[model samples]
Target: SGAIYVGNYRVVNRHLATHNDWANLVWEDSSRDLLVSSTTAQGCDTIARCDCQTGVYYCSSRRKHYPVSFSKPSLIFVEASEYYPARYQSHLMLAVGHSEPGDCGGILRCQHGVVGIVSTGGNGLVGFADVRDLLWLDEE
Candidate 1:
């Protein structure tokens, strides 16, 4: 619980919005090695999660092992709620977000706050909507 590492830095805080095809996590070294990607995307862009490098854990070695997806994004501004008015909800959105291999739920962060989540992507680009609005819907 009290530790830090060089530049993969440290996950010092726990946001705790956990899930599955998911596995409950414990901070052991072997758990970190499980390479993650989507079978459908067919490229390095499809390589979703790895400790090896989202930093250098990136690039196309094209050697894949596991898979997953979720939300959040940086490149997303337009949301699914605004465009797909009938089918999409407040959490839906669109962004110029280039298709990641399958890094779903890449949080759209601003400072420490989240703007959106990368819900789904296509040949173009897209993401989730104003999650702020989505999470707090009393009167807006």
Candidate 2:
């Protein structure tokens, strides 16, 4: 009822509370210095934060869709891990998806990996060492 041998990733549902959306076991080389969240993927302006914990990470894509006058912002998830103690660094990836076609993509991931999203505007920003612009909110 736990983890069993699989391949590149473990095939066990250990620590899983329920039979639902699952992910893979990210390696220890997925950290990054800068993470981007854009709509066209060419002109991204929004950034997010990436905090690691026990080989896991919590972060956001900071993608803000719709004008500041009629729509809410969406949160992007990220995941990551360090390469090693000698040369610890961050690698990353982004994602975009949705349940429908024109809805805001709900993205989530650990450390430096993003999941669940779509293609559209709603991008925001998140980063480190720049905490002074009235854009910091632990939770909303």
Candidate 3:
């Protein structure tokens, strides 16, 4: 399949994890016209593999499968990641963003009611996470 243009960048769901990092990748455009929810969850049994001919990576679960290609994407809004117990060995997550007709960070809007946490990666990726799931080891 192809990627659907939400804002400035075109994004397609490649529901597979590579040898690089992370379980799944959810992309957000700079304009924030779309939101990606459920990149990958750690609660399910996710099986990923590479195609011999096409040289594409494919991942699957008990339900469906998708490719793992990074053609075009960007950063913004929020990116969510889920982790399960070691038994299941899967990484399931959700990414939320603001649509053209909505407000920025509207998916998990912070109204000072439900406190949310933001996570930053060394790779320059920004995202949100559950407050409870976030660990405070040290301050930098």
Candidate 4:
């Protein structure tokens, strides 16, 4: 009786000491990277630190809405695995949610196969940065 499992993510209850609001799991032909944090936890900017344990704890969504009607910045709860030995430095210049240069690579969850190798975005940290910069968070 710890945490509940949702369709693709873990559901946090009224208690459980939740920390990070979101996270990103990037994998490649040879490596993987996963991280988490708060609102100030902007990808490539503040992706270096997180309030909760990386790849282990549960991360909440950014926008607090339940209805998926708007193109708002929603939460992508992809479970990043810590046992796979993910990259640590890559997250520095990672996340944008779209196609672009320097945009980190491979967005995945549950430690699955490559979603888009060589350069993937639009997941956790990836989409948060460039996605907002490209005009999305303004919906605030």
Candidate number with greatest lDDT: 1
What would you estimate as the lDDT of candidate 1? 0.29
Clashes of 4: 8
Off by over 4 Å in 4: 1-70, 79-101, 104-126, 130-140
lDDT of 3 by residue, 85-135 (tens): 222111212232212211112112221221121222213222222221212
lDDT of 1 by residue, 47-108 (tens): 12211111111111233212223243233332232223223233344444354544443444
lDDT at position 128, candidate 4: 20
For each candidate, give its TM-score against the true structure. 0.32, 0.17, 0.16, 0.16
The TM-score of candidate 2 is 0.17
Superposed by TM-score, candidate 3 places the C-alpha of residue 101 at a distance from the truth, in angstroms, of 34
Model 2 Cα lDDT, one tens digit per residue, 1-140:
11211122222112221222232223211222211111111321222343321121123233332111111222323322121133322222222211222232232222333221222222342211111111322222
Q: What's the candidate order when arranged by decreasing TM-score?
A: 1, 2, 4, 3
What is the Å distance of residue 33 in model 1 from its true position?
28
Write down the RMSD of candidate 1 (Cα, Å): 15.2
Which window of 10 residues has the lowest lDDT sum in candidate 3?
53-62
Model 3, CA-based lDDT: 0.23
Best by TM-score: 1
